[PDB]
Design a protein around this ligand. Structure first.
Ligand SMILES: OC[C@H]1O[C@@H](O[C@H]2[C@H](O)[C@@H](O)[C@H](O[C@H]3[C@H](O)[C@@H](O)[C@H](O)O[C@@H]3CO)O[C@@H]2CO)[C@H](O)[C@@H](O)[C@@H]1O
Ligand SMILES: [Ca+2]
Ligand SMILES: [Ca+2]
Length: 605
């Protein structure tokens, strides 16, 4: 039977993409720890740019990798719709693709204008906290004729074109809209030549290293498949001759692999598959050979454990990308030896990621044996103090996310959230990986979990009030209260909070003589007390206007010290809210906290 349950892995991979969503989430949201976020995206330019996916463990919406991810996901669904159908994940794949494509449509207000980034890398990365309460400004960036971006425009064209093929039978109207958009974007990319990173501040994160030549071939091919227009195939084959050669020879690049930046490698296989020309077969063969048996004595580094390690960053992402394409190629090539070689290589690399390695551990969060528990992800972590170090363990399980893994050919790895090398996660990391999984499900099978996702429960009160006796007294009660917002299911703002402290009027105490004072109060200090009925009264502290959210030391809490002086006769032992308050700060269950008038914590009399 399947060495690993590929269907379950795919099922969880689809969940990962759902957890990366930005904007107003649907009613059917499966990720209980995710809520609405980035609701003001595009506002700075008068556009609705909400939606799309957060790139990695951060909250920037990087259009280049986002588009590539979409193209790769669509490609896998086209190659193996059966894998998706059998794992019962086809509806989730479509849902995910529709989500990102709806964003691309919004980001393309007119034929030659494409918004390629929402958020600033540096501003975004300086803060460590949940997406729902991001406190910083998020700038929108775009490319147009004045400052083009052929690479990102052609990639978005390819994503929309590829995706249209997936919706073709389901929603032909939607598929038509995507094709129309892809045509415009490609014309823009072809007419106004230029590297997008020269126009938008993405160079430090997703710089266009390879340039746009590869995207022109890639985009042309996909539009050909989506339209059936021969001119596109012609365009692709023409542009193919301008692809990068290697070092000193006239041999096209074969030492890297396909990823968010370089699509050359994908076109080798795609064109070979389409035309059957020896030209493409030679290129594709050379590349895949380098990753397996080597060419001219040179071969991609391999660990003793059997992992192909291309580079330090997202090592497993590269191996998985190659594995998917090797699986596709293995089907078109006739050579029995090459077919076996490429196919077996792909299965071995994916199996390594699922647990077949020297550590005997899965590299997919929430899957298999001894998986990573602390991926470098802000929202999954759920910090409320703007610290990557607290709490020790991530508060949520980011099911399905493939981590960077071993960055050196020695199979070494440490599950450490602070290691952005080994524990980084990203939308592009799961792209080739998912497509590979779909191919494997079709071949080896597997069964998805009937009840997934699990419903997580909070690790304690999320929004509450702690209290302690600040100064002991007989004619007064001085409390030191602390409002806390450590929410994570999902993280949410508390900007309209107030709390009540009930007390019973005592014999010999005139309510008119009761005073409430403070020497330190981050909220308002009331002048009077409120009579409920009989001898029941309450003091109300008003914190409306204070933004209490899980995003920093001072941000997540509000300190309130208040003294209720009643004079001789004052007796707190018959006071409702006094029950259980001691000398140590601890949750006060009898002090009720309200959010815009609605009880959120504590029990009233
Ligand atoms: O020159 C070698 C090949 O480079 C490819 O571009 C890669 C860059 O060289 C590499 O530094 C960059 O690393 C990224 C990584 O992709 C990203 O996922 C991670 O989060 O951050 C890294 C930087 O810190 O990756 C790109 C893409 O592989 C060219 O695409 C290729 O043509 C060229 O031969
Ligand atoms: Ca490129
Ligand atoms: Ca009393």
């Amino acid at each position: 039977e399947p060495a690993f349950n590929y269907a379950e892995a795919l099922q969880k991979s689809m969940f990962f993409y759902e957890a990366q969503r930005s904007g107003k989430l649907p009613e059917n949201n499966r990720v209980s720890w995710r809520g609405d976020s980035g609701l003001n995206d595009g506002a700075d330019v008068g556009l609705d740019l909400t939606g799309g996916w957060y790139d990695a463990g951060d909250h920037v919406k990087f259009g280049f990798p986002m588009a590539f991810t979409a193209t790769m996901l669509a490609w896998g669904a086209i190659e193996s719709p059966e894998g998706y159908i059998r794992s019962g994940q086809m509806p989730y794949l479509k849902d995910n693709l529709r989500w990102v494509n709806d964003y691309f449509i919004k980001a393309h207000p007119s034929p030659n204008v494409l918004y390629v980034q929402v958020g600033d890398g540096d501003a975004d990365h300086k803060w460590w906290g949940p997406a729902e309460v991001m406190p910083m400004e998020r700038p929108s960036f775009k490319v147009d004729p004045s400052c083009p971006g052929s690479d990102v425009a052609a990639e978005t064209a390819a994503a929309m074109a590829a995706s249209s093929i997936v919706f073709a039978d389901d929603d032909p109207a939607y598929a038509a809209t995507l094709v129309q958009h892809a045509k415009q974007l490609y014309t823009f990319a072809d007419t106004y030549r230029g590297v997008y990173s020269d126009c938008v501040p993405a160079g430090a994160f997703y710089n266009s290293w390879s340039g746009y030549q590869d995207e022109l071939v890639w985009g042309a091919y996909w539009l050909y498949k989506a339209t059936g227009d021969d001119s596109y195939l012609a365009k692709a084959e023409y542009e193919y001759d301008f692809l990068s050669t290697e070092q000193q020879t006239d041999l096209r690049s074969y030492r890297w692999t396909i990823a968010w930046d370089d699509k050359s490698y994908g076109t080798y296989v795609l064109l070979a598959k389409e035309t059957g020309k020896q030209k493409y077969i030679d290129d594709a063969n050379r590349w895949l050979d380098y990753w397996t048996v080597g060419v001219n004595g040179q071969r991609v580094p391999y660990s003793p454990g059997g992992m192909a390690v291309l580079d330090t960053w997202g090592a497993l992402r590269y191996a998985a990308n190659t594995a998917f394409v090797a699986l596709v190629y293995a089907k078109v090539i006739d050579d029995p030896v090459r077919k076996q070689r490429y196919h077996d290589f792909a299965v071995r690399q994916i199996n390594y990621a699922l647990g077949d390695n020297p550590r005997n551990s899965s590299y997919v969060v929430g899957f298999g044996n001894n998986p990573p528990r602390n991926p470098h992800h802000r929202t999954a972590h759920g910090s409320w103090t703007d610290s990557i170090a607290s709490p020790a363990e991530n508060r949520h399980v980011l099911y399905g996310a493939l981590v960077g893994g071993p960055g050196s050919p020695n199979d070494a790895y440490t599950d450490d959230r602070q290691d952005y090398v080994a524990n980084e996660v990203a939308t592009d990391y799961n792209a080739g990986f998912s497509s590979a999984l779909a191919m494997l499900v079709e071949e080896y099978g597997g069964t998805p979990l009937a009840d997934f996702p699990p419903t997580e429960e909070p690790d304690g009160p999320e929004i509450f009030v702690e209290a302690q006796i600040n100064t002991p007294g007989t004619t007064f009660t001085e409390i030191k209260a602390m409002i806390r917002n450590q929410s994570g299911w999902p993280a949410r703002m508390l900007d309209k909070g107030t709390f009540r402290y009930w007390f019973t009027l005592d014999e010999g105490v005139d309510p008119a003589d009761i005073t409430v004072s403070s020497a330190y109060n981050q909220c308002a200090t009331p002048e009077d007390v409120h009579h409920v009925s009989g001898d029941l009264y309450y003091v109300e502290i008003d914190c409306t206007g204070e933004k209490i959210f899980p995003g920093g030391q001072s941000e997540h809490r509000r300190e309130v010290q208040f003294r209720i002086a009643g004079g001789p006769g004052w007796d707190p032992s018959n006071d409702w809210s006094f029950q259980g308050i001691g000398n140590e700060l601890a949750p006060a269950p009898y002090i009720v906290l309200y959010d815009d008038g609605v009880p959120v914590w504590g029990t009233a009399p």
